Every structure is written in C-alpha cells, then in structure tokens.
Design a protein around this ligand. Structure first.
Ligand SMILES: O=c1c2c3c(sc2ncn1Cc1nnn[nH]1)CCCC3
Ligand SMILES: O=c1c2c3c(sc2ncn1Cc1nnn[nH]1)CCCC3
Ligand SMILES: O=c1c2c3c(sc2ncn1Cc1nnn[nH]1)CCCC3
Length: 262
C-alpha cells in the first residue's frame, strides 16, 4: 500500500461510496490502482468504446462518417441535447459520435450501438483491441441502472485505463482515427467539475464523464501535463442507495491526490 493508496482510501471512507482509480503514466508505463480490478457501472463512459468502434469501421469505409442516420420522434430517450434538434431529419455518424462524446447525447449513443449491430458489437470491438473486461449489455437509458453487484454494462478501472491508452495514444486505431478521437475528447463540454477540477490548470485534458443511478459518477481522461509525457486516468465512483446524489467533487479529489503523488 502506497501513500497515494492510503489517501484514496481516506477519501473513499469520507465519501460513503466506493471509489475505483487507475492511472497509467506513459513516461515510464507505471500504474497506480485503487480497487483497480473491481467492477463499476460505466454509464456514459461507454460512449468512448462505441465511438471508437465506429472509427475502426471507418478505416475501411472512407465515407462511413458522412453516412446519414434517421432520427425519429420514437428514438428520443432521457437526454438528447443534440438529437432532438434533428428529429424527423438525419445526423451523420460523425455528428452522432461528436454529440455522444462531447454532449453525452444518449440518442446518439443508441445510433452508434445500432450501427455496430447492438451492445454486443461494442463488446466485440473491445475484445478485438485486447480488452477482456469491458461489457456492454444494454442500450440507453437502461445501461445506467448501476445496480450494485450487477455485472451488466461494467468494466474495471485497470481495463478502461489500458483501453483508453491504446485508443488515444497507442495504435488500436489508425492515425487519423486516433487523432479524431483525441480531438473529440479534448472538446468535451461536460468535464470541468470532474478529473479536470483536480489537476493543475495548465495541463490539457480530454475526457468523457458518466452519471447514473446509485449516484454513479465517473470520468475517464487522457492528460497532457506541462513538461512530461501524457497520463491516462480513470476515476469511477458509486454509492449504496439508488437515489444518491452526484459526486463529481470526489473525482476531482481523487485526481488531485494522483497529481500530488506524481
Ligand atoms: O468505528 C468507526 C466509525 C464510526 C463512524 S465513522 C467511523 N470511522 C471509523 N471507525 C473505526 C472502525 N473500526 N472498524 N471499522 N471502523 C460513525 C458512527 C459509528 C462508528
Ligand atoms: O434519466 C435519469 C435522469 C436524468 C437527469 S437526472 C436523472 N435521474 C434518473 N434518471 C433515470 C430514470 N429515473 N426514472 N426513469 N429514468 C438529468 C438529465 C436527463 C436524465
Ligand atoms: O448528467 C447526466 C446525468 C445526471 C443524473 S443521470 C444523468 N444522465 C446523463 N447525464 C449527462 C452526462 N454527462 N456525462 N455523463 N452523463 C443524475 C444526477 C446528476 C446528473
């Protein structure tokens, strides 16, 4: 047990919930884990895997990202900030990917899932890039039920950090697709209260947040600190009662402990 792990345990104890952290420092490939092999509900952090799977398909189909997808009134779910503007119209797969990642649009996520053939097509892409842990079992919005002990729609911090590294800094995607994913993550609108809030302001972050039942509050990030190689950091948090409040501050606190330990 490291000093960082003891601080994360103290943060977790004060929070009342269950915290999972995985850091990869690409300067030396070392890792810091807290509950790194426990499962957590992904909520909207799963949008990264779905967008990446579509990017992989686009490597052999130069026009795929320009393909229009119909949006019907019945397609709207519980949070559709972009898709609702296009009801009875279309959005391209690029527009759906950008809306899912940067606004957390759940209708857009469902269109990405459908393009991949269903939740299992997202899982299949995960397996193809070496992630044996990720599983997507449901569409939006039911993938956010976040029931303690339920394996559906979960991963572990260790697995998600490794996958996020391979997708954004490694070679799981082609070069232009990796750059597109990084551009999308860096343009996220939803992240300033989460990992980013615990890191030095001069550092550059791309991230995807998640929120669900059981007060589940998540963030997965690639970080370009000032003066050193990039980091990958995932922070997952879930709570004992179904109606628990969101706790983005806990993720900021975990990120700050990680940063102070570098
Ligand atoms: O007992 C508490 C408590 C209590 C709290 S917080 C706390 N923290 C540590 N500890 C010490 C401990 N030893 N074994 N498990 N926990 C609220 C009221 C009940 C007792
Ligand atoms: O969807 C939400 C949301 C949303 C919120 S809070 C919330 N809580 C539970 N749920 C899940 C739910 N509870 N009952 N039916 N579904 C704000 C953005 C839009 C979606
Ligand atoms: O914010 C929520 C929420 C919230 C809920 S559910 C939900 N679903 C999506 N979204 C949008 C989202 N952004 N990043 N991941 N998901 C309960 C209270 C706190 C906010």
């Amino acid at each position: 047990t490291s000093a960082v792990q003891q601080k994360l345990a103290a943060l977790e104890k004060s929070s009342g919930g269950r915290l999972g952290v995985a850091l990869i420092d690409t300067a030396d490939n070392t890792q810091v884990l807290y509950r790194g092999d426990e499962r957590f509900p992904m909520c909207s952090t799963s949008k990264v895997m779905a967008a990446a799977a579509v990017l992989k398909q686009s490597e052999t189909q130069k026009q795929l990202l320009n393909q229009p997808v119909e949006i019907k009134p019945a397609d709207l779910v519980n949070y559709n900030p972009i898709a609702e503007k296009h009801v009875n119209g279309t959005m391209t797969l690029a527009e759906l990917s950008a809306a899912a990642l940067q606004y957390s649009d759940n209708t857009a996520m469902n269109k990405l899932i459908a393009q991949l053939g269903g939740p299992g097509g997202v899982t299949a892409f995960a397996r193809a890039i070496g992630d044996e842990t990720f599983r997507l079992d449901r569409t939006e919005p039911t993938l956010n039920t976040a029931i303690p002990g339920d394996p559906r729609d979960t991963t572990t911090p260790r697995a998600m950090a490794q996958t996020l590294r391979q997708l954004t800094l490694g070679h799981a995607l082609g070069e232009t697709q990796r750059a597109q994913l990084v551009t999308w993550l860096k343009g996220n609108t939803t992240g300033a209260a989460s990992i980013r809030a615990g890191l030095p302001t001069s550092w550059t972050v791309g991230d995807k947040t998640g929120s669900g039942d059981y007060g589940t509050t998540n963030d997965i990030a690639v970080i370009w600190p000032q003066g050193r190689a990039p980091l990958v950091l995932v922070t997952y948090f879930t709570q004992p009662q179904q109606n628990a409040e969101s706790r983005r501050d806990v993720l900021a606190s975990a990120a700050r402990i990680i940063a102070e330990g570098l």
